[PDB]
Scaffold this active site. Sequence first.
Site, short mmCIF file in Angstrom:
data_model
loop_
_atom_site.label_atom_id
_atom_site.label_comp_id
_atom_site.label_asym_id
_atom_site.label_seq_id
_atom_site.Cartn_x
_atom_site.Cartn_y
_atom_site.Cartn_z
N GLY A 1 107.06 41.49 1.44
CA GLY A 1 105.92 42.81 0.02
C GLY A 1 105.94 42.67 -1.30
O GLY A 1 105.52 43.91 -1.39
N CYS B 1 103.63 41.46 -2.34
CA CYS B 1 102.24 40.88 -3.14
C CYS B 1 101.35 42.30 -3.39
O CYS B 1 102.18 43.57 -2.78
CB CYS B 1 101.36 41.02 -1.07
SG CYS B 1 101.80 39.25 -0.58
N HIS C 1 94.15 40.59 2.73
CA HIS C 1 95.16 40.43 3.75
C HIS C 1 95.33 41.74 3.94
O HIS C 1 96.68 41.25 4.85
CB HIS C 1 95.64 39.49 4.24
CG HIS C 1 97.47 39.54 2.50
ND1 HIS C 1 96.94 37.99 1.43
CD2 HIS C 1 98.22 39.91 2.57
CE1 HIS C 1 98.72 38.52 1.33
NE2 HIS C 1 99.18 40.27 2.21
C1 LIG Z 1 103.01 38.92 0.33
N1 LIG Z 1 103.74 40.33 0.65
C2 LIG Z 1 103.67 38.09 0.87
C3 LIG Z 1 104.97 37.54 0.17
C4 LIG Z 1 105.43 36.13 -0.05
C5 LIG Z 1 106.59 35.98 1.41
C6 LIG Z 1 107.27 35.66 0.84
N2 LIG Z 1 107.50 35.32 -0.50
C7 LIG Z 1 105.88 35.88 -1.14
O1 LIG Z 1 105.63 35.08 -1.51
N3 LIG Z 1 102.45 36.93 1.36
C8 LIG Z 1 101.82 36.72 2.58
O2 LIG Z 1 103.22 37.76 3.70
C9 LIG Z 1 101.60 35.87 2.62
C10 LIG Z 1 100.55 36.43 3.62
C11 LIG Z 1 100.23 35.42 4.99
C12 LIG Z 1 101.23 34.67 4.56
N4 LIG Z 1 101.64 34.76 3.75
C13 LIG Z 1 103.19 34.09 2.84
O3 LIG Z 1 103.18 33.96 2.10
C14 LIG Z 1 103.80 32.36 4.11
N5 LIG Z 1 103.15 31.66 3.86
C15 LIG Z 1 101.22 31.08 4.11
O4 LIG Z 1 101.07 31.29 4.30
C16 LIG Z 1 101.89 29.24 4.09
F1 LIG Z 1 103.36 28.73 4.41
F2 LIG Z 1 100.52 28.49 4.38
F3 LIG Z 1 101.56 28.79 2.62
C17 LIG Z 1 105.05 32.95 4.85
C18 LIG Z 1 105.07 31.61 5.18
C19 LIG Z 1 105.08 34.02 5.03
C20 LIG Z 1 105.16 32.41 2.98
C21 LIG Z 1 99.10 35.22 4.11
C22 LIG Z 1 97.90 36.38 4.20
C23 LIG Z 1 98.49 34.42 3.60
#
Ligand SMILES: *C(=N)[C@H](C[C@@H]1CCNC1=O)NC(=O)[C@@H]1[C@@H]2[C@H](CN1C(=O)[C@@H](NC(=O)C(F)(F)F)C(C)(C)C)C2(C)C
Lengths: 305, 305
Positions: free
Chosen positions: B143, B145, B41
């Site tokens: 950040g 991920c 992603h």
């Molecule tokens: C990666 N850099 C981040 C880290 C996340 C957010 C805060 N703590 C973590 O582990 N991950 C993301 O931005 C992923 C990414 C899009 C959105 N996302 C999320 O983690 C979101 N969650 C969901 O998708 C949900 F709610 F459906 F489970 C968020 C709302 C920001 C927590 C993708 C592609 C899934």
Amino acid sequence: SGFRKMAFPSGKVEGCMVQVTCGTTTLNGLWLDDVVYCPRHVICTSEYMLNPNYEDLLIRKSNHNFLVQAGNVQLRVIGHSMQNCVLKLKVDTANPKTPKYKFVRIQPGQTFSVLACYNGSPSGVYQCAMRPNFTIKGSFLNGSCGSVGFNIDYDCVSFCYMHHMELTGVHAGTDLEGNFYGPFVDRQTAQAAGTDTTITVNVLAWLYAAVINGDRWFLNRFTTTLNDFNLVAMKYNYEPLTQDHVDILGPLSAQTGIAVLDMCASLKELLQNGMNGRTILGSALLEDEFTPFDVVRQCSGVTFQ
Amino acid sequence: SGFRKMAFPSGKVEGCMVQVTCGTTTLNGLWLDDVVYCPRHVICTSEYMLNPNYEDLLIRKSNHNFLVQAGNVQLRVIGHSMQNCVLKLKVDTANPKTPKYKFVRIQPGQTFSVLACYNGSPSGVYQCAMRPNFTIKGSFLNGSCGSVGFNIDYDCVSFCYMHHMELTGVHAGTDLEGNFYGPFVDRQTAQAAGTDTTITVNVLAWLYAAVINGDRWFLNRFTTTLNDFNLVAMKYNYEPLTQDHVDILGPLSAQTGIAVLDMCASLKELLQNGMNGRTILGSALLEDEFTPFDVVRQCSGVTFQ
Ligand SMILES: *C(=N)[C@H](C[C@@H]1CCNC1=O)NC(=O)[C@@H]1[C@@H]2[C@H](CN1C(=O)[C@@H](NC(=O)C(F)(F)F)C(C)(C)C)C2(C)C
Ligand SMILES: *C(=N)[C@H](C[C@@H]1CCNC1=O)NC(=O)[C@@H]1[C@@H]2[C@H](CN1C(=O)[C@@H](NC(=O)C(F)(F)F)C(C)(C)C)C2(C)C
């Protein structure tokens, strides 16, 4: 989000750990530039394990009595000396993996990471606090002596602890200049740790972490004074709270919009009535081994390199 | 003695972390030989953050769209491809710090260390368990991920987890072949974690650790059967216990001279009556994120290099 007992990445320290053998005693040493630091009781044999004179023991040694190994490579000892409770072994090769470092003495309530080692080999990393009675509640087996505690500032490793002994379930050691934390000595006597207290500023920092992570059930609308709080803290073996602690908690107060003295009123209630079967951040006890700075770091995201 | 939530030393992994930027999205990647692995992603822009077609997004990219940095050095991307939910970026330089490694998929109940990173830079290390509902209770900010989970066997790093997303307080990810743990997808939908249960074999391992460390108050003389225990475990949302679990606990039974089924009778009592204000290894809750192997390792002293 989430909250974990988080340690510093240990790579910069793993590169400094060596094995030091003298006689039948092997333990760990710290190799920085061309000096290996290790506990002085490596020069003890079981006849002296109880009332040693270290000056005598050291003079009867020569450089060739000290076996130092960095993994498989051997390091040649070209000089030795004693600084308080540590032995400084001068070797012929400067450690190429020597990071930017300093030696700092920490205060009760401050936290650090411990790299537990055996035979010069890293085994595990964990986070712990220096207790108000100058012990740490570590996890250490035989042969762990010389393992070190450290913090990281940006790129700089601050060494603050070297492990020396276990005293009835808890652990005691020195700073890196060889001066013991607490009133302990490196021999077999009848020494015990004094009474421990709970680190109040750390409990408050942890309650702020809980709010940041969505645990709000313990809040209330009342506040209190520094002196009325400390009145109740004393009864529960909690350290008194100072204006300095209140200021330190400022950033967390700002980020959650809950005043320090407001949060103290919640702590007061928790101490008088207990948790009543609820948990906070997955704990059923009040946690005191996170500093205000640990919480900011984990709930803001500071890295290092 | 002592018992701590202990993580693996992280040095071998710190040397593999890089920063990957594509567009306005920056996250972490894992650089092994001449391949950088990272969540797919990273190729998402906010128009597609909800229902992306990754095959389409990938074909519209070229190698020059991917900014990869190892600290300050830039890595030149010479090829890219997708494997399930990970992106594999072929770069022009093999990582000289590449350890002996393998990719393993772990099972619920198993533990691993997480190296949390931001912008390719290691921030902290902590230990956690894969929950029976295929989430982990981590600590991750925006950040994070691409941060990875790992175990160490002697000299070999087993990578088992790459971080992708947070779902209402808990965390979800893939193995290193890009296959998600649990029934989750890497897009914004209405997905939630299922019901979590307590990992029974791990609770029993932790009770043995307590006995090894001198906490004995919860023992009793009665025993029980596998089927009478599991009858009570079900009522409390505990995983049933198998003969395989009993065998796994063998070494700890041997070292303490307490039979597994004997220990189950203590667990039974703790579940029916609670702790009644006592603690075990400094906890007022039953801890289930230590495997039988974690306990042996920490209460016997296995190292790595
Ligand atoms: C990666 N850099 C981040 C880290 C996340 C957010 C805060 N703590 C973590 O582990 N991950 C993301 O931005 C992923 C990414 C899009 C959105 N996302 C999320 O983690 C979101 N969650 C969901 O998708 C949900 F709610 F459906 F489970 C968020 C709302 C920001 C927590 C993708 C592609 C899934
Ligand atoms: C260093 N390699 C070991 C590691 C210790 C023992 C298990 N966990 C640890 O932290 N340390 C020692 O062998 C030191 C060393 C002699 C004895 N000692 C002890 O730790 C002992 N404790 C005491 O001296 C006591 F009881 F007085 F506090 C022991 C009984 C083995 C725990 C010296 C020079 C103090």
